[PDB]
Amino acid sequence: ENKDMCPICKTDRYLSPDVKFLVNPECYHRICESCVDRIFSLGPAQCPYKGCDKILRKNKFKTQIFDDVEVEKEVDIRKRVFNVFNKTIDDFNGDLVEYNKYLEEVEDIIYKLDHGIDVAKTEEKLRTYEELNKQLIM
Amino acid sequence: YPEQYNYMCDIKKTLDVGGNSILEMPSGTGKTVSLLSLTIAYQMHYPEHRKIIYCSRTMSEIEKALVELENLMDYRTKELGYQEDFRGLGLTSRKNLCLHPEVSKERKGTVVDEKCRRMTNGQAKRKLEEVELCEYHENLYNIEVEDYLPKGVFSFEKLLKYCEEKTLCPYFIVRRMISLCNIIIYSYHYLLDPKIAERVSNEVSKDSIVIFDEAHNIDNVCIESLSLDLTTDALRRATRGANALDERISEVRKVDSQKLQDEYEKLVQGLXXXXXXXXXXXXXXXXXXXXXXXXXXXXXXXXXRAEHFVSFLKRLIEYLKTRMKVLHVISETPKSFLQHLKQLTFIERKPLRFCSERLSLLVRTLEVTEVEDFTALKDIATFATLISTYEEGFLLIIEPYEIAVPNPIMRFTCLDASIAIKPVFERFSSVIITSGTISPLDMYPRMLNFKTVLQKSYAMTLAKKSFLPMIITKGSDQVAISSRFEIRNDPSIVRNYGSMLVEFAKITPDGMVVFFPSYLYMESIVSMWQTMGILDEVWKHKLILVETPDAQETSLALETYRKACSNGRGAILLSVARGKVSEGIDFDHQYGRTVLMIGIPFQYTESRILKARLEFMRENYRIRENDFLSFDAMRHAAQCLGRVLRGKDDYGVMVLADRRFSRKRSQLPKWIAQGLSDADLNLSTDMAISNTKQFLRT
Numbered sequence: 001e002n003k004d005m006c007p008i009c010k011t012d013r014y015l016s017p018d019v020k021f022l023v024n025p026e027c028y029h030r031i032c033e034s035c036v037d038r039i040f041s042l043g044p045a046q047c048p049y050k051g052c053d054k055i056l057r058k059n060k061f062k063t064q065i066f067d068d069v070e071v072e073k074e075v076d077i078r079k080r081v082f083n084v085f086n087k088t089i090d091d092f093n094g095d096l097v098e099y100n101k102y103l104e105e106v107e108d109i110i111y112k113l114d115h116g117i118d119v120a121k122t123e124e125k126l127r128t129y130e131e132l133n134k135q136l137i138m
Numbered sequence: 139y140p141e142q143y144n145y146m147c148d149i150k151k152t153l154d155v156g157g158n159s160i161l162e163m164p165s166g167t168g169k170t171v172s173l174l175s176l177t178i179a180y181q182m183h184y185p186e187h188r189k190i191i192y193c194s195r196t197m198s199e200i201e202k203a204l205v206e207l208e209n210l211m212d213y214r215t216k217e218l219g220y221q222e223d224f225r226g227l228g229l230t231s232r233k234n235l236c237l238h239p240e241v242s243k244e245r246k247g248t249v250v251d252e253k254c255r256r257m258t259n260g261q262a263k264r265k266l267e268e269v270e271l272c273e274y275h276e277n278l279y280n281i282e283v284e285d286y287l288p289k290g291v292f293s294f295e296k297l298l299k300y301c302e303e304k305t306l307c308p309y310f311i312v313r314r315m316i317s318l319c320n321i322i323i324y325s326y327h328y329l330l331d332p333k334i335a336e337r338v339s340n341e342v343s344k345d346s347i348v349i350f351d352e353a354h355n356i357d358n359v360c361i362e363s364l365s366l367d368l369t370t371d372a373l374r375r376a377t378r379g380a381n382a383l384d385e386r387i388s389e390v391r392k393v394d395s396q397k398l399q400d401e402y403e404k405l406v407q408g409l410x411x412x413x414x415x416x417x418x419x420x421x422x423x424x425x426x427x428x429x430x431x432x433x434x435x436x437x438x439x440x441x442x443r444a445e446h447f448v449s450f451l452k453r454l455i456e457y458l459k460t461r462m463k464v465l466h467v468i469s470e471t472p473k474s475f476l477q478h479l480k481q482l483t484f485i486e487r488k489p490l491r492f493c494s495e496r497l498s499l500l501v502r503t504l505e506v507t508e509v510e511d512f513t514a515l516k517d518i519a520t521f522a523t524l525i526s527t528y529e530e531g532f533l534l535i536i537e538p539y540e541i542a543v544p545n546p547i548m549r550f551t552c553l554d555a556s557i558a559i560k561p562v563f564e565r566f567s568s569v570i571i572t573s574g575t576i577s578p579l580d581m582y583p584r585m586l587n588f589k590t591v592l593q594k595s596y597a598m599t600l601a602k603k604s605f606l607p608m609i610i611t612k613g614s615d616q617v618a619i620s621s622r623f624e625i626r627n628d629p630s631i632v633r634n635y636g637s638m639l640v641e642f643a644k645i646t647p648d649g650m651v652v653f654f655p656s657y658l659y660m661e662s663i664v665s666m667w668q669t670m671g672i673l674d675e676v677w678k679h680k681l682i683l684v685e686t687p688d689a690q691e692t693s694l695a696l697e698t699y700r701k702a703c704s705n706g707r708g709a710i711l712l713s714v715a716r717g718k719v720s721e722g723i724d725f726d727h728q729y730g731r732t733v734l735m736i737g738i739p740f741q742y743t744e745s746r747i748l749k750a751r752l753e754f755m756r757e758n759y760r761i762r763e764n765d766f767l768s769f770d771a772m773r774h775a776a777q778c779l780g781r782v783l784r785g786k787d788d789y790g791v792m793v794l795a796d797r798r799f800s801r802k803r804s805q806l807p808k809w810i811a812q813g814l815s816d817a818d819l820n821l822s823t824d825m826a827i828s829n830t831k832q833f834l835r836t
């Protein structure tokens with residue numbers, strides 16, 4: 001929004017907004033350049049975005065064209081899980097039923113990750129990621 | 139008459155041999171020919187083989203076809219005294235063929251079909267687990283209603299009054315009578331409609347004769363079948379629609395989630411084919427013409443439910459907002475746009491099958507549907523169906539930024555029109571194509587490729603009753619050049635032209651109709667004209683078609699024209715050839731005996747659409763920079779020429795400015811080129827010769 005983009009620099013529109021507003025993937029919070037640079041420059045600490053406590057790490061930023069945090073998280077987790085599952089048992093022979101069922105399973109896993117449930121099934125999905133990675137290494 | 143009899147023989151031989159014919163009929167004397175030729179051609183074979191599929195461009199031509207068809211019924215019932223199985227079904231507008239919106243709604247909008255779906259859903263819900271039925275229902279599917287038409291003609295007005303008396307609804311009568319294979323009189327926007335052409339194509343059951351009446355705007359109708367402008371507000375309606383979908387997800391997931399799982403199982407087991415095969419009398423959504431699409435085995439989001447469809451739909455509309463917020467000038471290739479979309483997020487080329495199914499699922503799970511949100515979802519759904527399929531000739535274009543506020547627009551450019559018309563040449567044969575405003579008739583074998591025969595008009599007699607002069611010298615020959623620019627130049631010269639219109643209107647005060655290439659000249663001469671004696675002496679009042687036309691305003695202007703000409707007053711009708719209402723009702727002195735044309739017609743250039751279709755037709759037929767400034771203008775001028783011709787018993791005069799008219803053809807090519815001041819005295823003599831030769835030639 002034009003009224004919130006940094007708890008210290010929330011209204012920089014009349015100060016020539018020439019600085020970007022980075023967002024950390026472990027906070028989903030907007031921080032302007034001159035602030036975040038000092039943040040990760042003085043040490044990996046949390047940002048004071050409305051009393052935020054999640055630690056902001058050095059670098060590992062991203063540019064955002066803004067498609068809501070829900071859809072951005074669903075497409076980041078969607079792409080990551082899509083790369084973990086890769087194309088195992090997909091176009092191996094040409095079947096349409098089992099392929100769509102496996103895609104339904106993957107999308108249900110991404111759904112359980114973007115919803116979180118109760119922090120119990122998602123851990124089993126992480127073990128599934130380690131198993132799939134072990135299958136891709138072999 | 140022998141002249142029309144030749145066209146009767148041509149229609150006969152083309153109906154008995156050819157599969158399609160390009161017949162050029164004279165304006166004003168070729169409407170009643172095919173109507174009887176088709177019926178007699180049906181009687182000579184055996185009474186019920188092929189049926190009349192008459193297609194017009196307006197509703198006035200539909201009403202004229204209905205009353206002339208009644209003249210055929212009376213004509214065949216007054217000469218033999220034997221009663222036969224009558225035909226004639228009037229398929230008109232939904233708002234004009236319904237009775238309930240005139241009792242409680244008191245509206246004539248496009249949302250009457252939604253209320254009709256509310257009543258139909260009320261009937262289905264009172265026949266299943268339980269608003270009222272409607273006004274009268276449950277008796278519209280019986281044999282008596284199926285026989286009220288073959289025993290007696292009840293079309294449109296007679297059907298409206300007959301339903302108001304017999305307490306019936308005409309919508310289900312017409313819909314149930316499309317399968318009866320009567321003489322259907324509908325417009326071109328129904329034969330090629332991505333929502334109506336499917337059901338009509340499934341009810342007529344093919345095997346008939348199609349009659350393209352006034353088939354000169356076929357390319358315009360095929361163009362109007364696509365091109366939807368995304369003007370930043372549809373993004374807000376799509377956002378609120380996505381929020382409404384999320385609320386509905388919370389509602390169906392809150393308490394009642396069993397029906398969504400049962401219908402979901404119906405999708406996993408029987409897919410879209412079973413979903414559309416089980417539902418009866420339920421509201422449908424848009425589709426890119428399924429007979430032309432030919433895509434079966436529609437999987438429901440790779441076997442998924444609704445939350446995934448609204449998630450990928452939110453990602454899709456957000457990607458649309460991302461593609462609509464750009465610099466200014468940018469053109470899209472529909473394949474490159476789909477590849478870029480795949481680079482943003484994988485969704486494959488199947489969101490078409492994902493829209494046609496999920497929309498029906500939401501409909502099957504919705505009982506209180508909001509109209510704006512569902513409409514926006516149908517728009518985004520159509521955009522998805524047309525970025526997933528139909529790519530050859532399709533060209534996505536972004537409107538440039540010109541202020542940059544009033545700007546974020548995205549329009550899709552349609553494909554080759556031959557593709558859209560194509561199915562009628564497999565469904566049918568002996569499709570007669572008649573038009574009185576086609577000259578030359580070679581741009582229809584060229585553009586739109588189809589094998590056919592060419593028959594030109596062979597009727598031309600009594601040239602003294604059809605005064606056809608043209609004006610070249612306007613006294614200074616300076617307004618004919620300044621009246622051809624897109625933006626007018628030298629306002630004083632335009633004021634002089636308007637003064638010439640005042641002198642010409644004063645010379646011939648007997649009903650004047652003026653056609654303009656655009657409303658800019660009208661709005662420039664109507665602001666401050668320095669003269670008004672024509673309105674104060676001979677015309678009493680002037681008739682001006684608003685640049686934003688209104689139905690009631692145009693109707694009051696036409697009735698005002700008929701009453702003004704029926705009181706011995708007359709009025710100038712300042713209209714635009716590119717505007718609404720092309721007219722076509724004449725055969726009387728109430729219409730303009732003299733018609734004035736301001737130069738030649740012009741199409742608005744400097745547009746991305748004209749450049750896209752310009753290069754597309756350049757690659758197709760190589761008719762670059764030559765046919766788009768003479769063929770379209772020739773049709774627009776022929777729309778004004780057709781109003782002057784109204785039978786040999788009547789006369790008229792049409793003045794065409796600009797010498798460039800010599801570069802194009804015209805109906806009845808008998809034209810003399812002279813000045814306007816000389817044309818004043820020439821018309822002054824014609825207004826007496828036309829009155830003297832009548833009783834002499836009779």
Ligand code: SF4
Binds near residue numbers: 236
């Ligand atoms: S049944 Fe007839 S009158 Fe009633 S809503 Fe439908 S079209 Fe209108």
Ligand SMILES: [Zn+2]
Binds near residue numbers: 006007010035
């Ligand atoms: Zn700051």
Ligand SMILES: [Zn+2]
Binds near residue numbers: 027046049052
């Ligand atoms: Zn934070």
